[PDB]
């Protein structure tokens, strides 16, 4: 779902919608949520309400709007899950970071915003969170099981704002060597932080997933809440 009337525009002219969640009391820091490859779907809504109850405002931009606006896919549905793979395969990460940048500007200026903006990303969004972090567009970013992180190691020296990552130990998407590259690369920057949940795989934090692990999810989400706390 997307909020009716919300329209964010990128430097190149493209405009896209977003599922917005206003805070209970204002002003409050805004958390821009970067999606997985399934668009603004059920988990994205779940995530929106999770953060508003924790005391934040939430903005989940429709990043697939350049390819297919309003797309919201079900990972458990074979057909839909495949559309996701197709859209992900055509996804342009540069524009993704640009739209994210625009959504970040949107958030800092809302009547309820306190000027603080954090960014949380899952899967595809986990890679984007790292990149926005390397660009320095946010106060602090968090990534959940980011894919292709090992391919972005050269940007490690560029991140000058705190960033936290949660990676599952038995994540198929992350081969053992990738783990070594990631851990070794992130470790040097005192502002990056990567935790590995040994008994967890991919999407361990999304309940609909079979990879969901309650203890891993609980710890990960707790660390996320304490890392974001300074923004309030």
From Swiss-Prot:
Catalytic residues in the record: 123, 171, 202
GO MF entries: carboxymethylenebutenolidase activity
Gene3D superfamilies on file: alpha/beta hydrolase
Pathway: Aromatic compound metabolism; 3-chlorocatechol degradation
Pfam short name (any one): DLH
Membrane-spanning ranges: none
Signal sequence coordinates: none
BP terms from Gene Ontology: catabolic process
Tagged with keyword Hydrolase: yes
InterPro entries from the UniProt entry: AB_hydrolase_fold, Dienelactn_hydro, Dienelactone_hydrolase-like
Subunit record text: Monomer.
Family: Belongs to the dienelactone hydrolase family.
Protein name stated in the entry: Carboxymethylenebutenolidase
């Amino acid at each position: 779902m997307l909020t009716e009337g919300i329209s964010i525009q990128s430097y190149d002219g493209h405009t896209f919608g977003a599922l917005v969640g206003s805070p209970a009391k204002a002003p409050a820091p805004v958390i821009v949520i970067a999606q997985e490859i399934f668009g603004v779907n059920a988990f994205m809504r779940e995530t929106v309400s999770w953060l508003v109850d924790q005391g934040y405002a939430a903005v989940c931009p429709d990043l697939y709007a350049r390819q297919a606006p309003g797309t919201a896919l079900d990972p458990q549905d074979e057909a839909q899950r495949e559309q996701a793979y197709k859209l992900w395969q055509a996804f342009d990460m540069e524009a993704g970071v640009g739209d994210l940048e625009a959504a970040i500007r949107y958030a800092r200026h809302q009547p309820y915003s306190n000027g603080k903006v954090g960014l949380v990303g899952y899967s595809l969004g986990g890679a984007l969170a790292f990149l926005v972090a390397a660009k320095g567009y946010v106060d602090r970013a968090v990534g959940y099981y980011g894919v292709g992180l090992e391919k972005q190691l050269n940007k490690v020296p560029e991140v000058k704002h705190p960033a936290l990552f949660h990676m599952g130990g038995q994540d198929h998407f992350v081969p053992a060597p990738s783990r070594q590259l990631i851990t070794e690369g992130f470790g040097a920057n005192p502002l990056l932080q990567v935790h590995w949940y040994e008994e967890a795989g991919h999407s361990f934090a999304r309940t609909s997933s079979s990879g969901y692990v309650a203890s891993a999810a609980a710890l990960a989400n707790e660390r996320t809440l304490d890392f974001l706390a300074p923004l309030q």
